């Protein structure tokens, strides 16, 4: 695993082309996330 940038605890990827995309995030320490919900699902074929 790489390191967070100096002075920072994570990285945000801000979408700058696709108007509809939401942000993505990166942490560099496993302890900075807790897997709270397990969601089981199927994707649905559009009609």
């Amino acid at each position: 695993m790489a390191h967070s940038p100096p002075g920072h605890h994570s990285v945000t990827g801000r979408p700058s082309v696709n108007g509809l995309a939401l942000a993505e995030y990166v942490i560099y320490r496993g302890e900075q996330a807790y897997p709270e919900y397990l969601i089981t699902y199927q994707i649905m074929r559009p009609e």
Binding site: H9, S10, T12, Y25, E36, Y37, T40, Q42
Partner: protein, 161 residues
Amino acid sequence: GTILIDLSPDDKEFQSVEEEMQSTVREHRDGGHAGGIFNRYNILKIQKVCNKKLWERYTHRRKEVSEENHNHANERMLFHGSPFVNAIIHKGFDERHAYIGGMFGAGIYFAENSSKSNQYVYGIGGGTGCPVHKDRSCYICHRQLLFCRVTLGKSFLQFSA
């Protein structure tokens, strides 16, 4: 140490999680190549993941971050899709869940869009799709995402395509 508690679909907690799942679907640039073609999901089950050790590990770190950032953990709820979802719920996130080739370097990646995390469930770029049908767009096979509490603290803002 991990136990999974099923939530009833009548439980407001089931409903608010489902709604974050459905409402953060978007179309993807790949036309569905990685994750399949869909506008919404069929939610089959939502389970609360309870592990005392992993939780305390999380909150210990959260305090460290908070104290380095004017008492602000900058905590979010974000989606994660991975072939290693069963290892994650039992052993926690570690460097083996890192996206080595990720565009912001080798770390563990999370998405606000559920449909984005969906693209990783079967591997980077969706791998070869589901185990059974080798279909990245399989409408039959059961998939799993994690909805996660993530501490961002001071986040480095990268503007990007």
